[PDB]
Design an enzyme around this catalytic site. Structure first.
Site, short mmCIF file in Angstrom:
data_model
loop_
_atom_site.label_atom_id
_atom_site.label_comp_id
_atom_site.label_asym_id
_atom_site.label_seq_id
_atom_site.Cartn_x
_atom_site.Cartn_y
_atom_site.Cartn_z
N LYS A 21 0.84 -1.18 0.00
CA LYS A 21 0.00 0.00 0.00
C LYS A 21 0.88 1.24 0.00
O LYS A 21 1.83 1.34 0.77
CB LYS A 21 -0.94 0.00 1.21
N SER A 23 0.98 5.68 -0.02
CA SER A 23 0.34 6.72 0.78
C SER A 23 -1.13 6.93 0.38
O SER A 23 -1.97 7.18 1.25
CB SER A 23 1.12 8.03 0.69
N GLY A 25 -2.64 4.89 -2.55
CA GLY A 25 -3.05 3.90 -3.53
C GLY A 25 -2.11 2.72 -3.47
O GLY A 25 -1.07 2.79 -2.81
N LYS A 42 2.21 3.18 -9.05
CA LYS A 42 1.25 3.49 -8.00
C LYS A 42 -0.08 3.79 -8.67
O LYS A 42 -0.17 4.68 -9.52
CB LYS A 42 1.73 4.66 -7.14
N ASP A 133 7.86 14.96 5.45
CA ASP A 133 7.57 13.66 6.07
C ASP A 133 8.83 12.78 6.03
O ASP A 133 8.79 11.61 5.64
CB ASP A 133 6.37 12.99 5.38
N1 LIG Z 1 9.22 3.28 -6.11
C1 LIG Z 1 8.98 2.23 -5.31
N2 LIG Z 1 9.64 1.06 -5.58
C2 LIG Z 1 9.45 -0.07 -4.84
N3 LIG Z 1 8.60 -0.08 -3.77
C3 LIG Z 1 7.93 1.06 -3.45
C4 LIG Z 1 8.10 2.23 -4.22
C5 LIG Z 1 7.26 3.18 -3.61
C6 LIG Z 1 6.96 4.53 -3.81
C7 LIG Z 1 5.60 4.93 -3.71
N4 LIG Z 1 5.26 6.24 -3.83
C8 LIG Z 1 6.20 7.17 -4.05
N5 LIG Z 1 6.07 8.49 -4.21
C9 LIG Z 1 7.29 9.02 -4.40
C10 LIG Z 1 8.26 8.02 -4.36
C11 LIG Z 1 7.56 6.84 -4.13
C12 LIG Z 1 7.97 5.50 -4.00
N6 LIG Z 1 6.69 2.57 -2.58
N7 LIG Z 1 7.04 1.35 -2.47
C13 LIG Z 1 6.40 0.70 -1.35
C14 LIG Z 1 7.22 0.29 -0.11
C15 LIG Z 1 6.12 -0.22 0.83
C16 LIG Z 1 4.91 -0.59 -0.07
C17 LIG Z 1 5.38 -0.43 -1.53
#
Ligand SMILES: Nc1ncnc2c1c(-c1cnc3[nH]ccc3c1)nn2C1CCCC1
Length: 287
Positions: A21, A23, A25, A42, A133
């Site tokens: 999950k 922030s 979606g 996302k 944050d």
């Molecule tokens: N780019 C990613 N690559 C791999 N895993 C990622 C992500 C992100 C993620 C999700 N939203 C974001 N907004 C700005 C940077 C950013 C990174 N979030 N996650 C999450 C880590 C916990 C749930 C999935």
């Protein structure tokens, strides 16, 4: 607005399995069909989205305006029916908070992670952006140990006509006293949050982590600033002290902190952080 919004994402990207999950979606693994590199996608349904829409807009705006090795790279935003796909760099190493789960970090690891966070902050602050944050859960690593800032939904942007922000945002344990008071504040708020993050990286949890988050909203502006307690090097303790000054103008900038004795003496190649990444993979598997 979102002037460079695109359409038809599946002509260019393949959506794979859910990662977790985000922030606002769910985040999925994906593939860039032109390079065969893995990306993160996302996805948020604008049908169901309501209050979060302003922060969705802000995340996209900030992602689209950053071009730094220390900030999650942005491919683009795509409309697909009622859904928005925000396509980003895949960071597969785990968050810094994840990497804390198997046990304590050493000061080389702490200094290396903090140095990279500081490079990210120096970049953002030079662009008049405030992350707002900063915490270990929003620091994401690649599989090879690169460290990047993530989660920009509540980022602030200073302009020629608004030189300070005053919005109550962040995560309570990491919030600067002036943010809690909704005083006019700026990038120095991130420096406080960085200090709390340093304690988190060293001890595993921020100050007051035992308490209900609402209680820390009075504790933080009233109490003396936290200090780093325990058998840690003097430079690390002093690094934390420098960040955690109640008066924001007495906090150093990110640029100044990159020259701090703790960072210069202890930070090493980011590639060495793969040790931490492997430790987490082993730990999650033995679980
Ligand atoms: N780019 C990613 N690559 C791999 N895993 C990622 C992500 C992100 C993620 C999700 N939203 C974001 N907004 C700005 C940077 C950013 C990174 N979030 N996650 C999450 C880590 C916990 C749930 C999935």
């Amino acid at each position: 607005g979102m002037q460079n919004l695109k359409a038809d994402p599946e002509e260019l990207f393949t959506k794979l399995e859910k990662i977790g999950k985000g922030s606002f979606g769910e985040v999925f693994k994906g593939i860039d069909n032109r390079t065969q590199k893995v990306v993160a996608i996302k996805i948020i349904d604008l049908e169901e989205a309501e209050d979060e829409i302003e922060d969705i807009q802000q995340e996209i705006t900030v992602l689209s305006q950053c071009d730094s090795p220390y900030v999650t790279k942005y491919y683009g935003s795509y409309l697909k029916d009622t859904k928005l796909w925000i396509i980003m760099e895949y960071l597969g190493g785990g968050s810094a908070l994840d990497l804390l789960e198997p046990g304590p970090l050493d000061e080389t690891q702490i200094a290396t992670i903090l140095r990279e966070i500081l490079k990210g902050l120096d970049y953002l602050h030079s662009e008049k952006k405030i992350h707002r944050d900063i915490k270990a859960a929003n620091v994401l690593l690649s599989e090879h140990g690169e460290v990047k800032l993530a989660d920009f939904g509540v980022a602030g942007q200073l302009t020629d006509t608004q030189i300070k922000r005053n919005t109550f945002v962040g995560t309570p344990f990491w919030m600067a006293p002036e943010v809690i008071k909704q005083s006019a504040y700026d990038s120095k708020a991130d420096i406080w949050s960085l200090g709390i993050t340093a304690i988190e990286l060293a001890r595993g949890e921020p100050p007051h982590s035992e308490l209900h988050p609402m209680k820390v909203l009075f504790l933080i502006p009233k109490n003396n600033p936290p200090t780093l307690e325990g058998n840690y090097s003097k430079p690390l303790k002093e690094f934390v002290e420098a960040c955690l000054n109640k008066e924001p103008s007495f906090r150093p900038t990110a640029k100044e902190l990159l020259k701090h004795k703790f960072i210069l003496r202890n930070a090493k190649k980011t590639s060495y952080l793969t040790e931490l990444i492997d430790r987490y993979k082993r730990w999650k598997a033995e679980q």
